[PDB]
Amino acid sequence: MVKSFYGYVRDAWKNPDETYVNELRWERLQVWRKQGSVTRIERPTRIDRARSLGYKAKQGIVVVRVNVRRGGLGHVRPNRGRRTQKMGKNKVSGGMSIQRIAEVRADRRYPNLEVLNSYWVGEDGKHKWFEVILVDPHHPVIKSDKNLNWVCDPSSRGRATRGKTSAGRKGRGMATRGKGTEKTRPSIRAYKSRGK
């Protein structure tokens, strides 16, 4: 079958535990642990996924590995008097996924760019790693572009901290239509947050 090499990379990352990618994981995890919270990397770790999510090789497009802990929302026991249903907090995991946390940290680190998408790249017993694709709206190469000039608009500022990314809309309960989405569209706030 006449197939592109993106297909082969996709297949290789389809089942990481049963290919050559496991050894590469073993080497890469050490170097990744030595690094910081947010790091700029020249090339994406998985080319096919990045191209699928809207990555091109031009100026003004940046890619970054973020580092986020595992587990639920670490929550404090209430100091004062609750009612025995609000008193417990150890089993109460959060309401925000880990991709959203990763993208928000990346946005906080880069004040001039704007988040586009992200994807899963690895994980171990203490950490998870994602890569976030960032686009610069004030670069002339982006402005001339016809498939990316929508980001040079006054409604795309802070695009990641208002739940407009793909993971944000997954977490808002708006990944589908029909039954079950009675109280999740066009927004959570519109229904007094009884959805989600």
């Binding site: 592109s4 090499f5 993106y6 990379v9 990352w13 050559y20 990618v21 080319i47």
Partner: protein, 115 residues
């Protein structure tokens, strides 16, 4: 396997130059991969500096299953320079000898010896 001697690699680069000026070469990972899949490659040249390594990982087993002679090259810069390009090229492929056919077959025999 055994890494090919330096004279073999220089012979491969010279044949690459000759087929460039005279024949036809697909250069670029995507075009060379599709050429191997269809099956027309006289010889496959692959660099060994790729990070991430997934770019050229599939080439080896695919070529060996398709019965295609693949060689390894030390760096991207010289492979890119050979193809007639100011930028590095990860993998090229001699689709058509043009005039360097004899280098094609004798490099194939040399690779059989090394394997």
């Amino acid at each position: 396997k055994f890494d090919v001697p330096e004279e073999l690699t220089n012979k491969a680069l010279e044949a690459l130059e000759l087929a460039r000026d005279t024949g036809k070469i697909k250069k670029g990972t995507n075009e060379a991969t599709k050429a191997i899949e269809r099956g027309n490659a006289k010889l496959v040249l692959i660099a060994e500096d790729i990070e991430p390594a997934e770019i050229v990982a599939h080439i080896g087993p695919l070529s060996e299953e398709k019965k295609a002679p693949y060689i390894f090259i030390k760096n991207q810069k010289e492979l890119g320079a050979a193809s007639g390009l100011g930028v590095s090229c990860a993998t090229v492929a001699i689709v058509d000898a043009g005039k360097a056919a004899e280098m094609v077959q004798d490099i194939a025999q040399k690779l059989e010896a090394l394997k």
